[PDB]
Amino acid sequence: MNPKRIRALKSGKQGDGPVVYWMSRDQRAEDNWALLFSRAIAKEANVPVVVVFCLTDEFLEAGIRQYEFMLKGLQELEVSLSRKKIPSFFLRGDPGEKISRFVKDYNAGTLVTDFSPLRIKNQWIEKVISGISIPFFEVDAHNVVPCWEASQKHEYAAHTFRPKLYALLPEFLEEFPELEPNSTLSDVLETGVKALLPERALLKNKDPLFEPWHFEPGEKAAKKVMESFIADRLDSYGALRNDPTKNMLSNLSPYLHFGQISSQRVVLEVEKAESNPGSKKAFLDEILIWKEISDNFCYYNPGYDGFESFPSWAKESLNAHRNDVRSHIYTLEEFEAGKTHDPLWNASQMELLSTGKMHGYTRMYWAKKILEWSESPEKALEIAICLNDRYELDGRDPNGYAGIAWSIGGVHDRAWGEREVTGKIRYMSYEGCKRKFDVKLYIEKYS
Ligand SMILES: Cc1cc2nc3c(=O)[nH]c(=O)nc-3n(C[C@H](O)[C@H](O)[C@H](O)COP(=O)(O)OP(=O)(O)OC[C@H]3O[C@@H](n4cnc5c(N)ncnc54)[C@H](O)[C@@H]3O)c2cc1C
Structure with a gap:
C-alpha cells in the first residue's frame, strides 16, 4: 500500500x-x-x-x-x-x-x-x-521499485544502478495483500488470426515455422515455470546461463513481458530459496538489475530506439568507422530468413523463428553481427528492432530496446578494443563462442 x-x-x-x-x-x-x-x-x-x-x-x-x-x-x-x-x-x-x-x-x-x-x-x-x-x-x-523512485535520471552503468536499487529493496520488496472481491474473446482471436494469416512465418513446404508448445500461456502456466526454475534449474543457473546448448534459464521472459507474472513474486520466491549463493546473485542481477534498468532506459530516453541515445564514446567511435568497408552486407530479407555466411548466427535466427525465444547468450551474438553486416549503425538498429519485435514472444519491450542498445550502441557497457567497422563496441567472435560452449550442438538443434 x-x-x-x-x-x-x-x-x-x-x-x-x-x-x-x-x-x-x-x-x-x-x-x-x-x-x-x-x-x-x-x-x-x-x-x-x-x-x-x-x-x-x-x-x-x-x-x-x-x-x-x-x-x-x-x-x-x-x-x-x-x-x-x-x-x-x-x-x-x-x-x-x-x-x-x-x-x-x-x-x-x-x-x-x-x-x-x-x-x-x-x-x-x-x-x-x-x-x-x-x-x-x-x-x-511491473517493477519492484517504482521506476520514478529508483533513480531520477538515466543510469549510465549497472554498477551505479545496483546500489540504488538494493538500497530501496528493504522498503519495496514485500509480500502482496490478497485481492478483495467486490461487494467474446473467442471471436476476436479467430478474426485476428485470419487477418494475420497471410503474414504467418512458413518454411517453403508451407508447413509453419513457429512451434506453439514450448511455452503455454497465462498466469497458471507462469507459476509452474517459476516453480520449476527454483526446484530444478536455479542451482545451476549461475554456471550454465551462458551456454545455449543446455536450457537452464528461467524461461520467464514471455510471461514477464505480458505481465502474466510479477517479477516481485519471482524475487520473493528466489530470495527464500536456499540455492547456490552465486546462482542466486547472478539470477537476481538479471530480473532486478538488468530488467529494471531497461525501464530506466526507456523512461529517461525519449530516443531509446535511436542512435542519438547511444553514449558519446560509442557514437563518435561508430561515426569514425562509418566509411569502413563491411565484410558483408545483408538485407532485411536475408537476415530474416537466416541466409548469412555464419552458421551460428543462422541457427540463432532459426531458434527465434521456430520457438519465439532466442537464448539470451546468443541474443547478444545475433544483434552485434547485425551491426557488423549493415551499411550503418542506424540501419543495424532498424533491422534488430524489426526482427526482435516481429519474432520474439518477449519483445515490443523495454528489455528489447535496451538489450539492442547495449548490443549495438554500448548503452550500459564500456569501450572495448578499437576495431574496424564496429569501433570500440564490445566484440563477439564465432571463435570466441566455441571456446565458451559446444557451438556445433546448437547449430544441429536448429537446422
Ligand atoms: C539483443 C537483445 C535483445 C533482447 N530483447 C529482449 C526482449 O525483446 N525482451 C526481453 O524481455 N528481453 C530481451 N533481451 C534481454 C534478455 O535477452 C532476455 O530477458 C532473456 O533472454 C529472456 O529469457 P529468460 O527469462 O529465460 O532469461 P533469464 O537468464 O532467466 O533472465 C531472467 C529475466 O531477467 C531479465 N533479463 C535477463 N537478461 C536481461 C537483459 N540483458 N536485459 C534486461 N533484462 C534481462 C529478464 O526479465 C529475464 O526474463 C534482449 C537481450 C539482447 C542482448
Missing part, C-alpha cells in the same frame, strides 16, 4: 461510478499493485472495480505467436477476475477513442492504469487525457 508506487497523470472531479482499471502491461489477477490500488480506491468510494483492456490496431505489426499467447492469457484471466466478482471489458480500437467512450458511457469515477515507459503507451495516455475529466493515475505494477 506504498504511495510511492502511484503517480497522478491528471487530476479532475471524481465521478459517482465504478473505478476503472485500464489494464495495459500487467495482465494478471494476482500480485498486481495496479489492480490492488484500483480496488482500494473503489473500497473507499463505495463503488465496484472493473477492468478494461483495449485490443489495439497494432497487433497486425506482430505475429500470430504473440497474438495467441496474449489472448489465451486473457481468456484464463477473464475467468479469474469474474471469480473475484470483477468484470472485465475488452475493447477493439485504439485507447484514445475507446477508453474515452467507456469512461463517459459507464460514468466512471476514477481511471487507473499500469506503468510502461514505451512511446506507444505515452501516445495513448495523451489521447485519453484529453478525452476525460475524472482523475487519472498510473501505478508501477
Whole structure:
C-alpha cells in the first residue's frame, strides 16, 4: 500500500461510478499493485472495480505467436477476475477513442492504469487525457521499485544502478495483500488470426515455422515455470546461463513481458530459496538489475530506439568507422530468413523463428553481427528492432530496446578494443563462442 508506487497523470472531479482499471502491461489477477490500488480506491468510494483492456490496431505489426499467447492469457484471466466478482471489458480500437467512450458511457469515477515507459503507451495516455475529466493515475505494477523512485535520471552503468536499487529493496520488496472481491474473446482471436494469416512465418513446404508448445500461456502456466526454475534449474543457473546448448534459464521472459507474472513474486520466491549463493546473485542481477534498468532506459530516453541515445564514446567511435568497408552486407530479407555466411548466427535466427525465444547468450551474438553486416549503425538498429519485435514472444519491450542498445550502441557497457567497422563496441567472435560452449550442438538443434 506504498504511495510511492502511484503517480497522478491528471487530476479532475471524481465521478459517482465504478473505478476503472485500464489494464495495459500487467495482465494478471494476482500480485498486481495496479489492480490492488484500483480496488482500494473503489473500497473507499463505495463503488465496484472493473477492468478494461483495449485490443489495439497494432497487433497486425506482430505475429500470430504473440497474438495467441496474449489472448489465451486473457481468456484464463477473464475467468479469474469474474471469480473475484470483477468484470472485465475488452475493447477493439485504439485507447484514445475507446477508453474515452467507456469512461463517459459507464460514468466512471476514477481511471487507473499500469506503468510502461514505451512511446506507444505515452501516445495513448495523451489521447485519453484529453478525452476525460475524472482523475487519472498510473501505478508501477511491473517493477519492484517504482521506476520514478529508483533513480531520477538515466543510469549510465549497472554498477551505479545496483546500489540504488538494493538500497530501496528493504522498503519495496514485500509480500502482496490478497485481492478483495467486490461487494467474446473467442471471436476476436479467430478474426485476428485470419487477418494475420497471410503474414504467418512458413518454411517453403508451407508447413509453419513457429512451434506453439514450448511455452503455454497465462498466469497458471507462469507459476509452474517459476516453480520449476527454483526446484530444478536455479542451482545451476549461475554456471550454465551462458551456454545455449543446455536450457537452464528461467524461461520467464514471455510471461514477464505480458505481465502474466510479477517479477516481485519471482524475487520473493528466489530470495527464500536456499540455492547456490552465486546462482542466486547472478539470477537476481538479471530480473532486478538488468530488467529494471531497461525501464530506466526507456523512461529517461525519449530516443531509446535511436542512435542519438547511444553514449558519446560509442557514437563518435561508430561515426569514425562509418566509411569502413563491411565484410558483408545483408538485407532485411536475408537476415530474416537466416541466409548469412555464419552458421551460428543462422541457427540463432532459426531458434527465434521456430520457438519465439532466442537464448539470451546468443541474443547478444545475433544483434552485434547485425551491426557488423549493415551499411550503418542506424540501419543495424532498424533491422534488430524489426526482427526482435516481429519474432520474439518477449519483445515490443523495454528489455528489447535496451538489450539492442547495449548490443549495438554500448548503452550500459564500456569501450572495448578499437576495431574496424564496429569501433570500440564490445566484440563477439564465432571463435570466441566455441571456446565458451559446444557451438556445433546448437547449430544441429536448429537446422
Ligand atoms: C539483443 C537483445 C535483445 C533482447 N530483447 C529482449 C526482449 O525483446 N525482451 C526481453 O524481455 N528481453 C530481451 N533481451 C534481454 C534478455 O535477452 C532476455 O530477458 C532473456 O533472454 C529472456 O529469457 P529468460 O527469462 O529465460 O532469461 P533469464 O537468464 O532467466 O533472465 C531472467 C529475466 O531477467 C531479465 N533479463 C535477463 N537478461 C536481461 C537483459 N540483458 N536485459 C534486461 N533484462 C534481462 C529478464 O526479465 C529475464 O526474463 C534482449 C537481450 C539482447 C542482448
